Amino acid sequence: TQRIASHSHVKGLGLDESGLAKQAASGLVGQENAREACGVIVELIKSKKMAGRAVLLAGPPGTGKTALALAIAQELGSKVPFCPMVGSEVYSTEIKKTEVLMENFRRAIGLRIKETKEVYEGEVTELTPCETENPMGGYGKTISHVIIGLKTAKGTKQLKLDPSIFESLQKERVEAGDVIYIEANSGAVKRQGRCDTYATEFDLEAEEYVPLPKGDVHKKKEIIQDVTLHDLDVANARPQGGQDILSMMGQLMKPKKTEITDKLRGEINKVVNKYIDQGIAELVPGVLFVDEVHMLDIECFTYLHRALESSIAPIVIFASNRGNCVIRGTEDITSPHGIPLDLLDRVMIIRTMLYTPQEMKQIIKIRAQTEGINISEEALNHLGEIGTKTTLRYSVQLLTPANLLAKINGKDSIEKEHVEEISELFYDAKSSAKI
């Protein structure tokens, strides 16, 4: 299911090799200076040299601030994490605002952790070659080595493992004919189950028979797991393993999202650095796109302009849509963009001008193309004219309903009559203001 979203045509900033801006910028049109600033900041992000830097996508409504935000996000690629957040999400009834902001900052930061493990598997043929008793002591019966005949699909390879592991072999039901999961360093044996070759159709049992391993006995499984710092925080927050945690009444209330700074910073950062400099993981700072930043309370901005001061804070892309308005939580304290004047000094303002009527027509045409419906020249011109009259977002919403009206009327392309009828069946707020 394609499930076309509101604005999915944006695929990237579409900047030329020289870094300038063009019209057909991979879905997004116009906004030359804004897209160039987006390119500069995405180059910054890719550099991964600076932290705690914020940028403000100030601009009137309809300038496609969220559009260019998703464009730069896609340009960054799925490699680096991108956590979208709206100012309303900060208001939580169970966890304070600043801690939600810190959790979002952590989510915005990524971390790839590699893990290589040398493991041996295959059908076992246990046999202990009798050896003279310990030569340092007396005589008797001892075992200096324990040979395990691991048989894999590719062949057979006997391993003369250490004799001390014999306890593990006897611990689990390791009988001749089952698949075992050996570990190089640890040596612990974990039986996977009997081989399917012995799973007679008349034997009723499940989870006990497994297929033979494909490949050499010695396998060096390399696996990479990308988890944000917030994932590690949550994992180390709650407990696991016994301790009467199975209770329902006094424990089912899992929403204990409350978090402290000691655990968040400190030990977690240190272990992350140890994994980084040791070669076990690679840090991947992402981006935190915060739209409707003006909706945050002053208690949120006062914590933002302090968290951005930290060396670990990721890149934040604020997108304020309102203009000069009183800061929330303050007594008639008017500030530009609804953001305190102190935080605006820490953010780079990327201004976005209004779309030219030609840009409106281009946007309408590319949205119609993405939708997959053909529109005649006259219909497209009428759509552009009405998008110039009222908000541009009204025109793009008139494509699908006009398309369905055309399809039901027996015609394929959206004729001017269809859009004309839809404009009278549906209209915008500017016309609805006539109460």
């Binding site: 202990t128 014999f166 009988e175 001749a176 012995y198 159709e201 008349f202």
Partner: protein, 86 residues
């Protein structure tokens, strides 16, 4: 030494049973006749053959069903060691 190391022979890979009425991979095992089967028609034919056998000392003929190209043996000697139903 014997307890911690039960040096037993391999698991003696079992037989790949086959349905005697249709020659397909047997999916079931008739209880009274103790011969594998895979379909309801096969079960009915097996029950009829077992009834014919238990009727007399031993069924002289052998029931035939779904004879492929090569000469089908029509297996009577697929001895069912199980006794009477009840």
């Amino acid at each position: 030494f014997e307890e911690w190391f039960p040096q037993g022979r391999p698991p003696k890979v079992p037989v790949r049973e086959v349905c005697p009425v249709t020659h397909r991979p047997a999916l079931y095992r008739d209880p009274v006749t103790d011969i594998p089967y895979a379909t309801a028609r096969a079960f009915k034919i097996i029950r009829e053959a077992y009834k014919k056998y238990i009727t007399a000392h031993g069924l002289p003929p052998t029931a035939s069903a779904l004879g492929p190209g090569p000469p089908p043996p029509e297996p009577l000697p697929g001895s069912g060691p199980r006794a009477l139903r009840q």
